[PDB]
Symmetry: C3
Subunit: 116 residues, 3 copies
């Protein structure tokens, strides 16, 4: 049984601009574990990682039927499983969370399906 669906599309430029401005951005969006990978990356990949997590969390919030400003970015965490795919390691949902993220050199998209 499906109990929610959310999607999100984001321009990487907006994320790169945010990072270039205040250093506190990535920190607000990512947990400690996520920051570990974020800081281990270089150039485009580094921005893409952050953008993807932002998009995934935004998509999840919509899947729950609300805004990320109510859940909070630190309330969610996206790591990579043994098969290398991104997944919610932390989220206020008990069922299965189907997540998928994809990007180009200009956009990142994410889709979330909550299942019970």
């Amino acid at each position: 049984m499906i109990v929610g669906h959310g999607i999100d599309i984001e321009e990487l430029a907006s994320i790169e601009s945010a990072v270039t401005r205040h250093e506190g951005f990535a920190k607000r969006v990512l947990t400690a574990l996520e920051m570990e990978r974020f800081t281990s990356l270089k150039g485009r990949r580094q921005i893409e990682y952050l953008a993807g997590r932002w998009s995934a969390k935004e998509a999840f919030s919509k899947a729950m039927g609300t805004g990320i400003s109510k859940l909070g970015f630190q309330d969610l965490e996206v790591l990579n499983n043994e098969r290398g795919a991104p997944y919610f390691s932390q989220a206020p949902f008990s069922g299965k969370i189907w997540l998928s993220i994809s990007h180009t050199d200009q956009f990142v998209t994410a889709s979330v399906i909550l299942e019970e």
Copy 2:
């Protein structure tokens, strides 16, 4: 059980150009209730509302296996609930309609999953 899935992306610019070559464009795309919302917004947000409604209605039509021009714009209605999330208040479907909409400065995407 899932009975349909559809996604759609619309360029805001195309929507506005349409609002230009056809003065009554909005009126034909939106229901009376959607029009009342549309007429209360302005600038970018107004266009985004209209474009997002088009995306949602097309995503749904594709989820039903067809197109919006065939299904009819007036037979679909997307309003916003108490939490501000878009949802189908009107549709020729007896099951659950899981809708999500997201946009950038230039595009708006919608994803619909139908469930019985």
Copy 3:
């Protein structure tokens, strides 16, 4: 129950460059039947078709967890669907595109 979910966004440029780089790109990405369609098309519509197929197959591959073993055709209503794929459950596919990129979404259900 859902057993997989995958999406993809692909810029038309990556596909356009790929076609030129190796003329056999399309042939490698598309099955015989898909190629027949590709070849019958021209210009932007032709590129879009190739990009949409690449996108859909990528989305499917990500949903599962050779693009020649995957085939996406169009039904009588014009909607794209997987006619061939290493999965016996239901494959819910949807593709959409702008002038610069294509997106695809796949949900696998049993």
